[PDB]
Amino acid sequence: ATADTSPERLAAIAKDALGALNDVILKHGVTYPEYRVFKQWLIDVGEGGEWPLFLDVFIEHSVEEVLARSRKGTMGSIEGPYYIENSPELPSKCTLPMREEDEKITPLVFSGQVTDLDGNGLAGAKVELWHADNDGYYSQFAPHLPEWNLRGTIIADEEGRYEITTIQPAPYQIPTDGPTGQFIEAQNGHPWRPAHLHLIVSAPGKESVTTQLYFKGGEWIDSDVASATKPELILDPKTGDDGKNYVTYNFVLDPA
Amino acid sequence: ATADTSPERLAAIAKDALGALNDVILKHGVTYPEYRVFKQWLIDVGEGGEWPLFLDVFIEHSVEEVLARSRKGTMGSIEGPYYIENSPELPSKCTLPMREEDEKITPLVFSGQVTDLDGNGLAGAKVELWHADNDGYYSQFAPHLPEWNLRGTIIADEEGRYEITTIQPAPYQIPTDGPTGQFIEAQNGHPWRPAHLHLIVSAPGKESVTTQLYFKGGEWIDSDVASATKPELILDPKTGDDGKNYVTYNFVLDPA
Ligand SMILES: Oc1cc(Cl)cc(Cl)c1O
Ligand SMILES: Oc1cc(Cl)cc(Cl)c1O
Ligand SMILES: [Fe+3]
Ligand SMILES: [Fe+3]
């Protein structure tokens, strides 16, 4: 990873950030024992490979909020830590890869259209979808799972539309024993994210959008540990006589 | 390391700290490329074992500043990362362990008295002294050095006094290639600490003081990268006809 940042912009960000943290120590009268625990915890975060987790939970929302200002299309949200590039391509009307066991969960049929800002549809738009299974696991972050379970890149047809059948994910819990979980537990917090689909939607000549979609009335919807939920991102699926849940949701992309 | 912190105090510190960092992202419009570099850097800090270095340089000063409020004795300063407990004991009038090569550097003769707050001297006071050599290396953090080079615990006599001969340390440079050095270099900073003695002074029934002492007119005295220098901590050694530098400095300890 690289960025264009000048020495002066970095100096300014650094002075503010560090000044901020020093101000917090002075405000709260942080003690030497607390400092020692803070130091060992930072070390444990790295040793337990949780920098992506901790930052995406506690920081990324502010980075998306910055990005949000320059966008007029559908609301974005954080990528989070579990995105994998180049998920296998599926047809405009498809079902995500899933195990037999996934197949016993009430189906979720997700329809809509990728369009531009004036409302014109888009040929060759791709919807990358990833989410957790009913157990709350992601493929490639759970050895039992086929590597593309509930992962795909859907090719939207000439008109910019898709019909993706999947399952509704379960809410996600940050493992309690890790440093991030330990951090949460020490302040009497909830290590939970509401159930969510992750999507990256792209089209030729267009600025891709990373977003998440949530489920009306679902638990933790009002207390996401990642501060990543937005009202505009909440789905209200309706159930069909096949007992399947149906939702339609359209994506609106900005120009590149 | 453990601390007594309640879930509510931790919650409050966390909300402030995180809120602070999020506020900085929003202020400066931190970008996704910058976030990715920030994430890989945090990972590199841990992989390069620099959490003690980075925190002691950029944070510890605020923790000592908090501690300073409750103390009426000599000014403290940060411990920094290179303290080692149980350095071998030496007599009230002693010379620190050093190599032949150290012995060609103009001697520093450091005298004074450990006393209480009303000015009474103290039997069985210990002055733990550690510092870098003329090359800027610490023993136990440099494989070529004898493990207690320029390290000792001096036993102050019945009256609370010592006469420690050593050398003046060189200024210390944070290695430029590490993540901390890289951080400094990216903002056009100086990776330098002024030359300094580290001392932990203790006495029976007394609250120990961690401090540092610096050298008047020495370089980086006005721009310590650790923000750890104080006016009260600056020595003005006088040179003797043996061409040795002499300084006297007294420690005043609080009750435990
Ligand atoms: O699946 C996730 C897991 C974590 Cl820890 C954080 C976010 Cl934002 C996720 O989307
Ligand atoms: O010897 C030192 C080295 C670093 Cl990096 C920081 C401090 Cl505060 C020191 O005293
Ligand atoms: Fe997720
Ligand atoms: Fe030092």
Identify the CATH number of the domain in which residue B33 sits.
6.10.10.40
- Gap between the Cα atoms of B87 and B80, Å rounded: 17
Is the Cβ pair A13, B30 closer than 8 Å?
Answer: yes
| CA of residue B59 to ligand 3 center, whole Å | 33
Name the resolution in angstroms.
Answer: 1.9
Smallest-distance ligand from the CA of A80: 1
Q: Which residue among B71, B95, B130 closes a domain?
A: B71
For ion ligand 3, residues whose CB falls within 5 Å = A 80
How many domains is chain A partitioned into structurally?
Answer: 2
Among A4, A38, A64, A69, the strongest candidate for a mutation testing the B interface, having the largest count of B CBs within 10 A, is A38
Same domain for A207 and A176: yes
Strand partners, A110: A164, A247
B35 contacts in chain A (CB < 8 Å):
55, 59-60, 63
Q: Which residue among A9, A44, A71 closes a domain?
A: A71
Continuous segment of H or E residues that includes residue A57: helix A51-58
Q: Which of A17, A28, A45 sits opposite B13 (nearest CB)?
A: A28
Look up the CATH number of the domain holding residue A107. 2.60.130.10
Residue A170, CA distances (Å) to A78, A79, A102, A108, A210 in order: 18, 18, 12, 12, 20
Same domain for B65 and B106: no
- Gap between the Cα atoms of B18 and A12, Å rounded: 18
Amino acid code (one letter) for B246 = Y
Q: Could you give the count of Cα atoms lying within 13 Å of A249 in the half-sphere of its Cβ?
A: 24
Q: Could you give the count of Cα atoms lying within 13 Å of A149 in the half-sphere of its Cβ?
A: 24
A200 contacts in chain B (CB < 8 Å):
none
Determine which residue's CA is closest to atom 2 belonging to ligand 2: B80
CB A111 within 8 A of CB A247: yes
> Is A82 close to ligand 1, i.e. is its CB under 6 Å away?
yes
Same domain for B95 and B22: no
> Is A193 close to ligand 1, i.e. is its CB under 6 Å away?
yes
Task: Write the DSSP assignment of B94-120 as a string of letters.
Answer: EE----TTGGGSPEEEEEEEEE-SSS-
| CA of residue A213 to ligand 2 center, whole Å | 48
Same domain for B256 and B142: yes
Helix (H, G, I), strand (E, B) or coil at B192: strand
| CA of residue A53 to ligand 1 center, whole Å | 7
Q: Supply the DSSP symbol for A136.
A: S
Q: Supply the DSSP symbol for B14.
A: H
| CA of residue B133 to ligand 2 center, whole Å | 13
Q: Which residue among A23, A51, A71 closes a domain?
A: A71
Same domain for A78 and A89: yes
Same domain for A200 and A109: yes
The tokens for B157 are: 């006599």
Is the Cβ pair A7, B33 closer than 8 Å?
Answer: no
The residue among A169, A146, A134 whose CA lies nearest residue A99 is A146
- Tell me the shortest Cα–Cα distance from A93 to chain B, in angstroms: 32
Same domain for B95 and B65: no
Among B9, B35, B209, B223, the strongest candidate for a mutation testing the A interface, having the largest count of A CBs within 10 A, is B35
- Return left, alpha or beta for B99; rule: phi > 0 is left, psi -120 to 50 is alpha, else beta: beta
Determination approach: X-ray
Q: Could you give the count of Cα atoms lying within 13 Å of B213 in the half-sphere of its Cβ?
A: 20
Amino acid code (one letter) for B127 = V
Residues shown for chain B: 256
Neighbours of B177 (CB within 10 A): 9
Same domain for B109 and B7: no
The residue among A136, A160, A133 whose CA lies nearest residue A149 is A133
Nearest CA in chain B to A29: B66
Same domain for A255 and A151: yes
Identify the domain containing residue A137 by its residue range.
72-256
Query: Could you tell me which residues of B are annotated as the binding site for Fe cation?
Result: 138, 172, 196, 198
Strand partners, B105: none
The residue among B23, B181, B210 whose CA lies nearest residue A65 is B23
CB B30 within 8 A of CB A30: no
CB A139 within 8 A of CB A150: yes
Same domain for B114 and B8: no
Farthest CA pair distance, chain B: 63
Phi, psi angles (nearest 5°) of residue B24: -65, -45
> Is A125 close to ligand 1, i.e. is its CB under 6 Å away?
no
Helix (H, G, I), strand (E, B) or coil at B201: strand
Beta strands in B20-140 (DSSP E): 89-90, 93-95, 107-115, 125-130
The residue among A21, A56, A23 whose CA lies nearest residue B38 is A56
The tokens for A189 are: 């917090």
Same domain for A153 and A207: yes
Continuous segment of H or E residues that includes residue B245: strand B245-248
Same domain for B148 and B199: yes
Distance in Å from the first CA to the final CA of chain B = 21
Give me the numbers of helices (H) and strands (E) for chain B, helices first please. 5, 16
